[PDB]
Scaffold this motif. Structure first.
Motif, PDB file in Angstrom:
ATOM      1  N   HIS A 144       5.883  15.490 -16.762  1.00  0.00           N
ATOM      2  CA  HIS A 144       5.124  15.486 -15.530  1.00  0.00           C
ATOM      3  C   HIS A 144       4.229  14.281 -15.348  1.00  0.00           C
ATOM      4  O   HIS A 144       4.109  13.810 -14.242  1.00  0.00           O
ATOM      5  CB  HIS A 144       4.325  16.778 -15.391  1.00  0.00           C
TER       6      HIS A 144
ATOM      7  N   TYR B 150       2.210   7.620 -11.291  1.00  0.00           N
ATOM      8  CA  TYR B 150       1.777   8.596 -10.295  1.00  0.00           C
ATOM      9  C   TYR B 150       2.954   9.462  -9.887  1.00  0.00           C
ATOM     10  O   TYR B 150       3.879   9.004  -9.202  1.00  0.00           O
ATOM     11  CB  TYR B 150       1.158   7.905  -9.061  1.00  0.00           C
ATOM     12  N   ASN B 151       2.904  10.718 -10.345  1.00  0.00           N
ATOM     13  CA  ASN B 151       3.965  11.674 -10.163  1.00  0.00           C
ATOM     14  C   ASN B 151       3.343  13.015  -9.800  1.00  0.00           C
ATOM     15  O   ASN B 151       2.507  13.542 -10.566  1.00  0.00           O
ATOM     16  CB  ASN B 151       4.772  11.833 -11.458  1.00  0.00           C
ATOM     17  N   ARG B 152       3.763  13.566  -8.656  1.00  0.00           N
ATOM     18  CA  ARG B 152       3.206  14.819  -8.144  1.00  0.00           C
ATOM     19  C   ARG B 152       1.696  14.618  -8.021  1.00  0.00           C
ATOM     20  O   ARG B 152       1.270  13.558  -7.521  1.00  0.00           O
ATOM     21  CB  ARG B 152       3.543  15.990  -9.070  1.00  0.00           C
ATOM     22  N   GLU B 153       0.915  15.565  -8.493  1.00  0.00           N
ATOM     23  CA  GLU B 153      -0.525  15.452  -8.500  1.00  0.00           C
ATOM     24  C   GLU B 153      -1.111  14.633  -9.658  1.00  0.00           C
ATOM     25  O   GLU B 153      -2.265  14.484  -9.720  1.00  0.00           O
ATOM     26  CB  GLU B 153      -1.225  16.813  -8.479  1.00  0.00           C
ATOM     27  N   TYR B 154      -0.258  14.182 -10.548  1.00  0.00           N
ATOM     28  CA  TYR B 154      -0.669  13.554 -11.805  1.00  0.00           C
ATOM     29  C   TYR B 154      -0.691  12.005 -11.750  1.00  0.00           C
ATOM     30  O   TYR B 154       0.352  11.337 -11.851  1.00  0.00           O
ATOM     31  CB  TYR B 154       0.200  14.072 -12.978  1.00  0.00           C
TER      32      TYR B 154
END
Ligand code: HPA
Ligand code: HPA
Ligand code: HPA
Ligand code: HPA
Ligand code: HPA
Ligand code: HPA
Ligand SMILES: OC[C@H]1OC[C@H](O)[C@@H]1O
Ligand SMILES: OC[C@H]1OC[C@H](O)[C@@H]1O
Ligand SMILES: OC[C@H]1OC[C@H](O)[C@@H]1O
Ligand SMILES: OC[C@H]1OC[C@H](O)[C@@H]1O
Ligand SMILES: OC[C@H]1OC[C@H](O)[C@@H]1O
Ligand SMILES: OC[C@H]1OC[C@H](O)[C@@H]1O
Ligand code: NA
Ligand code: NA
Ligand code: NA
Ligand code: NA
Ligand code: NA
Lengths: 245, 244, 244, 246, 243, 243
Positions: free
Chosen positions: C5, C41-45
């Motif tokens: 994630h 930067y992936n999804r909210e992460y």
């Protein structure tokens, strides 16, 4: 007039109180102090006024187990105690690391009691005051006594059966350092009552190896002496801190 | 080698044991007996051999609260106790009927502890032994001492707070008679360890009315006397029944 | 092979990590630093390598809510993170004392999540590391920023309904200082994974008074600035304490 | 108005009531009596007045399972019943000691239901009235019928699956003697409603050994006869005690 | 004026909403529509009005995990959403049957969260709306895309530890098809708020076999394209069915 | 040999089974059929082979309450049943909308029993088969019999006490439609044993207003007839599918 179980008055309660399980240990402690005054002894609850390093604080026994100690802690917290340190014995849950006679200073506990749950939802943490914790640590260091730190499992079950598995191995895996019977109950009551708490413990064995003989009821004498010195030094320091502020 | 907390040997455990919470009560009981032999006193656990009506049985204090008394009860049950009667104090959950000084002989209890649940699932009943309950009642009758019978709430909480409601009113509505702190734990350990158990209790106030002064730490003297005579008589009978 | 994630490699994890809910906040924090390198930067992460006071540590966003932040914390903790500080926002549970814009440094939390319970029994405490707590307190003092200390309620429910009562008033009575959504989950995962944790939080309103307009998710500017200064100072200090 | 499920009136409820799971057992019990009056049979609930040894008491079937029996017990307890004895069948949890055809009189039970928990907190005991228990034991003695005594596991699960382990071995280790499906529910309702309860049960198998054929719902006929005689004798005895006192 | 986390107004909410976990996925879906209008982006919550087959409906991201998605779902349900379809990814709990890339349309879910329990007792079912389920299935057949149907486990725990056993094997035995993280929370909030819900999921691996490579963060592109075609078509049908 | 409680052989169990609580209802149903064969009557369990619209299916009574019906349902599901429909009675939880004599077709249930929990964790949904649900609804529509749809509370407590609050008002607020005692247990056993389940229920009163006289367990005759026609038609339609 007199508290119901301690049989002392509100006026005899000092801001700082040292608590111990065994009314026998109160006698061991009071002789270490500069002087003392016996106040009362009712049921398991023995109350002595200690004088140590210029300071005045009670040492009170709480008995074995969370329900009986909660009676003691409530009578203290509701009648003027501001700081309570528990000085107790425990089993090691990390037998490779923490051995008989070793000392552990604990900042939090597993609430494996009932009384804390009857006072507040289980999700609530059993946690000590972190300045009390720091004072205990600092005193051990000043005294050149090595100590461990970590979480205590406070369990209402001392002797397990073969039907329901004990959670001790789960908590060992979860990195709890030690197991005893009262600390979580003190911590929760303290938080609820606005009383600062902490815990220092001497190891008497390892409950995973009781079948091997890894238990001695007679605590290692010099290590017991060291724990009492650390606990008394911390009570005196917190008493002087309280008195200034 | 001595029991860890009782500090008596397994050979010193009698088939019948009378248990009480207050070590100070052991001295009150032992002087009612024909004779007694002091055995040990460690922590809150005081042990005396009582001789009464030609029988021999321990009287042992178990301290306040379920986890502390469980340590006592396990050491007795794992080391040869066959019958254990708790003689204790309690609050009334039925203040219109059960008053300060009254005596209740209880057949079952509410498991508001933790240790019994660490030993067996909560659905399991805290229930006493029939013969023990019957002997207690028969002895009260013979001594002409009126008693109540009912369920005890055994709660680990003596002082409630204002966050989580106490269950005491619920249990009063459910027709529980009294409240104390140890009886459920005794009963469950006894069932698990094949030890016959029972309880007789003296009322010292009403928790619903503590704010009105409905409490006295000093137990009504003649009623404590009667409770002790009932408990000692039943212990002696059960000791001969056990022989038999 | 990248973390599932976070989308950074194991090799990019630093001993110290500063975590925040809002990926937008990672970008506000990085520009305060001496310099920075954007990592992923992936999804909210969102993951950024921060350079501050000659130290290097990640700042990583974790998203809203315990289950999502656990994914973040597990990937950090299982791949080299040793100290994790959460800098977040919260509501006051003590509106007479703790006001919008105040900062609270929290040593422990209420586990009103699910994921911590799926990892370890409910009785286990959500508790922070003493060193991390002490360093955060010391930096606030060194910056002459007043702060509160106390327990956070970490609740998975932001919007209560009219069926099952919120426990927030109970916890206020129990002396919990503040409420947010992630800190208990961080602390339990850290304890299980031998990672040191802590939390510093800025008040954005009081949940008891949302109906009165006691809320604003525009965080008080100079106070948010202060909290970021303390958090970054503590991370730099703890990076060197780890090195020793 | 008639009781909703029993379809008898409040006036027909006697101070003492014998309950059984199987409506068919109400037929075997009644013909043992001096006389009987068939009252109603609605759903699984068959009600008959029994006349035995000078005394009058209902025998009523309660169906299989705790929620269905609770409806019956509530209707009885809310409309004048003062004593309820369950005479049922059960499995052995102590196969080395308690075998098919044996009779157990039980004075408490494991609350592995739901309805009792919807009425009172789980910590509350399922316990019988000890006068009822004593009367059942004394009747067994007078009739020279050996019996066992102990706790019943009352479980809402008859057929276990392979996902959630049964608690039955646990409770066997805990010294529970037998397993059935209704007794805890009767006991808790009785306690809440001030009705004295008890239980006598005949063993039809051992649930640990069902895969070995340790089961027959054809109850051992001479033992069923004995259980019925004990239960009827105890009801008659409790009926006279009730009438003398009241 | 603006919803606290979505930062859109009540007026901007359409009767039908498509929800997805990843804000990156809203960008990938929107470009596939006939046209779109970006509305807001705050934290992990991105909101875009989509136009497809003559109908309009929002596509909104909800983030990873039940507590975060409940904030999104409450804001939609309390401000005028009438139908919500979650399109997401999942693991297979039936690896002999349901494989990487396979598509599962779900009518109910296991409530392994906390937030649903803070709203309503655990005994209450997480169940989707019939019309939504039926519409999803019907679009799938319409497009000749094979799908599976069953129960999802919605678990707050993605990474299990070695202390407390994961219940996933139990739920596999209980015939749950798949595992993900949000659907039960959507279903319960929907039921409580009188909003019609459903779920369509693409399998990205099997949690029983992660330790042997049964996982890929790249969703099978054509199966993913098919899932989204099913989801968008259903949103359009329901926007008319609703109309 | 014979099923322990139903006292029929496995050979006698048909793919489709209609279940009802009251054995008296079995006798009522069988005479609406084109023909029937009485099979067994043991305890509360009465079994009849029905012949209706050229199809063959059992009708079996399950008795009052979840533990007793589970015994019936396990015996069916473990010995060849593929589809089970419950046709029962219920109380209204929405007395402004749903009245005495109304018919509700339900597709999930609140698990306020014990036996489902002894079989699978409480988080698992009690949910009906959506094809069975749809079949019941379609049969209602074509007989022009208006029906409600929604969740049933299946509660093991019929008579509440004054100590522990009933959860019924909570569940009414949660939009549950009706209350009965068996449906959740059916649904869970069916999901676990790969059996397709469904529920149609006739309202006999409202438990919130029992003290006002809002009850009659004499079911509205024309409405009971309508429910039976719906349940029988659905059993036949589903029976043609088995093969
Ligand atoms: O090993 C133990 N277990 C519980 N309490 C204790 N107190 C000292 N040792 C122990
Ligand atoms: O009122 C009481 N409550 C609990 N324990 C007691 N022991 C005597 N009285 C009481
Ligand atoms: O008031 C709050 N409640 C929960 N989470 C929060 N985060 C900021 N404020 C709050
Ligand atoms: O073995 C059994 N299990 C549960 N109930 C029973 N009733 C008779 N035998 C049994
Ligand atoms: O395997 C998984 N587990 C939980 N959530 C998921 N989302 C995609 N795959 C998974
Ligand atoms: O009102 C009810 N409650 C429970 N079960 C029922 N079955 C018919 N009506 C009802
Ligand atoms: O022996 C048991 C006692 O020692 C430590 C424990 O806490 C208890 O009071
Ligand atoms: O004062 C409290 C004590 O008295 C009765 C109770 O059981 C406890 O040990
Ligand atoms: O608005 C809710 C968010 O702010 C703080 C809280 O912990 C959550 O991530
Ligand atoms: O066959 C099971 C039935 O018999 C005994 C049990 O209690 C149930 O009613
Ligand atoms: O990989 C984690 C995410 O994908 C599916 C799951 O629901 C979660 O939001
Ligand atoms: O009267 C109670 C009965 O009717 C419907 C309910 O489910 C139960 O079997
Ligand atoms: Na004690
Ligand atoms: Na993104
Ligand atoms: Na999130
Ligand atoms: Na710590
Ligand atoms: Na039944």
């Amino acid at each position: 007039n007199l508290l119901r179980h301690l049989k002392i008055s509100k006026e005899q309660i000092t801001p700082v109180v040292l608590v111990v399980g065994d009314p026998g240990r109160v006698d061991k402690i009071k002789v270490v102090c500069d002087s003392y005054v016996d106040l009362a002894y009712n049921r398991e609850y023995k109350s002595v006024e200690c004088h140590y390093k210029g300071q005045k604080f009670l040492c009170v026994s709480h008995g074995v187990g969370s329900a009986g100690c909660a009676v003691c802690f409530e009578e203290l917290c509701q009648n003027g105690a501001k700081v309570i340190i528990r000085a107790g014995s425990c089993g090691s849950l990390q037998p490779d690391l923490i051995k008989r006679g070793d000392i552990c200073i604990c900042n939090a506990a597993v609430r494996e009691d009932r009384v804390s749950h009857l006072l507040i939802h289980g999700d609530f943490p059993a946690v000590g005051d972190f300045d009390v914790y720091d004072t205990l640590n600092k005193c051990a260091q000043e005294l050149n006594v090595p100590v461990f730190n970590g979480i205590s499992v406070s369990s209402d079950m001392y002797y397990p059966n073969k039907i329901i598995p004990s959670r001790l191995e789960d908590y060992s895996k979860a990195n709890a350092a030690v197991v005893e019977m009262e600390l979580a109950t003190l911590m929760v009551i303290g938080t609820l009552r606005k009383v600062k708490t902490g815990g220092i413990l001497i190891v008497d064995g390892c409950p995973f190896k009781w079948d091997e003989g890894d238990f001695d009821n007679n605590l290692v004498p010099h290590q017991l002496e060291n724990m009492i010195k650390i606990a008394l030094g911390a009570c005196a320091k917190l008493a002087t801190k309280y008195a200034l502020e």
